[PDB]
Amino acid sequence: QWALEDFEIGRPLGKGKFGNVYLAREKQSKFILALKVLFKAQLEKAGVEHQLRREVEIQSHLRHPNILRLYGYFHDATRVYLILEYAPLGTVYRELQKLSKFDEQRTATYITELANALSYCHSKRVIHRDIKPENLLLGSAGELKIADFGWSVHAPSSRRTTLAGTLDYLPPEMIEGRMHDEKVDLWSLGVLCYEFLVGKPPFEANTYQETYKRISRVEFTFPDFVTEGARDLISRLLKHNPSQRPMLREVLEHPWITANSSKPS
Ligand SMILES: Nc1ncnc2c1ncn2[C@@H]1O[C@H](COP(=O)(O)OP(=O)(O)O)[C@@H](O)[C@H]1O
Ligand SMILES: CSc1nsc(SC)c1CO
Ligand SMILES: [Cl-]
Ligand SMILES: [Cl-]
Ligand SMILES: [Mg+2]
Ligand SMILES: [Mg+2]
Question: Which residues bind ATP?
Fold first, then answer.
């Protein structure tokens, strides 16, 4: 169906490890979208064909206001192209670098939108496993949308692929190569809530080896300005044992969330 000739390409929207993402417009309809370009040589060399297929399969079937749409794909012997919904206000990562820290209302609103999207995912036994600020995009009304489903799977799971970059958002069971389930995304939700309020993630460290140590031991502390309600939510989410982490309904119902968020369940 679709080919490169059907699109006019515009400015770079971002770069990932494999992803080179561009603004584009479809010629006949003038429909604006994001084109995610991957190089087949790099996909083959790293052996991550299966991840890309999972990304297309999982993300194209999901339909939720807080999850980014994937419309389709095509390829041309050197490259693969994913056709994505365009997120005009950019990444949460960028917003955090701009403002340094988010206030309690902004943070609780983002956490509510995340928990809604994740609740929808988990009801189909889909786990994302790569929730972090560079994979959270912002819609035209500033609403949060989860993206980059390349690491997503069905539960329960092991890990068959090498961990690439940062350990900062991964729970103990994942970095220790053990078995995991849905609760991995709840740990990440805890890490994000802390990073939003404080400006850096709770286990951050100068080396891989030391970050690993802080995560496995769950060593983190709070700055004085973090309030009692935020501390209670974060401490419940960052439990070493997965089964002790709250259910998403509990997060959505938590008193600090209900007091500060400006969106509903
Ligand atoms: N739909 C989109 N709208 C706007 N920017 C995007 C979109 N998709 C990706 N980006 C930008 O490109 C970056 C990489 O996209 P991503 O899908 O996360 O690639 P990778 O799989 O390589 O991480 C994002 O971190 C973001 O900065
Ligand atoms: C989802 S289409 C897809 N995934 S991986 C690869 S490797 C070339 C392709 C193209 O056939
Ligand atoms: Cl497995
Ligand atoms: Cl894997
Ligand atoms: Mg990404
Ligand atoms: Mg990816």
Answer: 17, 36, 85-87, 134-135, 148
